[PDB]
Each structure stands twice: as structure tokens, then as C-alpha cells.
């Protein structure tokens, strides 16, 4: 039994998706600052 797998690997994976999303939506928030800025 390698047990660990079913409760943990499946978490690791989730948190790899998670982190991607974070920096990502930020690149857009970065572009928002600029979006305001150019009109300003």
C-alpha cells in the first residue's frame, strides 16, 4: 500500500494549478494599472 498517493499526490497537483492562477490574474492586474494609466 502506497496510500499516501490517494490523499496527497492529488493535493500537490491542485496546488500547482492554484499557484499558476495567482501570478496569472496578477499579470492582468498589472495591465489594469497600465490600462488606467494610458487614459489618465
Amino acid at each position: 500500500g502506497l496510500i499516501k498517493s490517494l490523499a496527497e499526490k492529488e493535493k500537490q497537483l491542485l496546488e500547482r494549478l492554484e499557484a499558476a492562477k495567482k501570478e496569472a490574474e496578477e499579470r492582468v492586474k498589472r495591465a489594469e494599472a497600465e490600462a488606467k494609466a494610458l487614459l489618465e
Binding site: 490517494l6 499526490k9 494549478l17 499558476a20 495591465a31 497600465e34 490600462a35
Partner: protein, 62 residues
């Protein structure tokens, strides 16, 4: 083991899709601005000159 490997195999390509979507979402924000800023400022250049010359003209009419 290999079982959970398939669970791995699923996640990595998704990480990249979050990014591709994202990339487009920053760029577009950037590009929405690019045209908009340029297009108003033109109009405000325009407008300011006319709102000048026609006065000076009307002044010439004095």
C-alpha cells in the same frame, strides 16, 4: 507509482492553460488602453486647436 502518475500527467498541461488564458488577459488590458488613449487625445488636440483659430479669426473680423 504509475496510477497517480496519470493524475500528474493531467495537471501539468492545465498549469500551462491557466497561463495562456492569462497572457491574453494581460495583453488585452494593455491593448484596450493603447487605442483608447491615443484616440481621445487626438480628439482633444483637434478640439483645442479649432477652439482657438476660430476665435482668432473672429478677432480678425474685429
Amino acid at each position: 507509482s504509475k496510477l497517480e502518475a496519470i493524475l500528474s500527467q493531467e495537471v501539468e498541461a492545465e498549469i500551462q492553460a491557466l497561463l495562456q488564458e492569462a497572457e491574453a488577459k494581460a495583453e488585452a488590458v494593455k491593448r484596450e488602453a493603447e487605442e483608447k488613449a491615443k484616440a481621445l487625445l487626438q480628439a482633444r488636440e483637434r478640439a483645442l486647436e479649432a477652439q482657438y483659430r476660430a476665435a482668432l479669426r473672429r478677432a480678425e473680423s474685429a
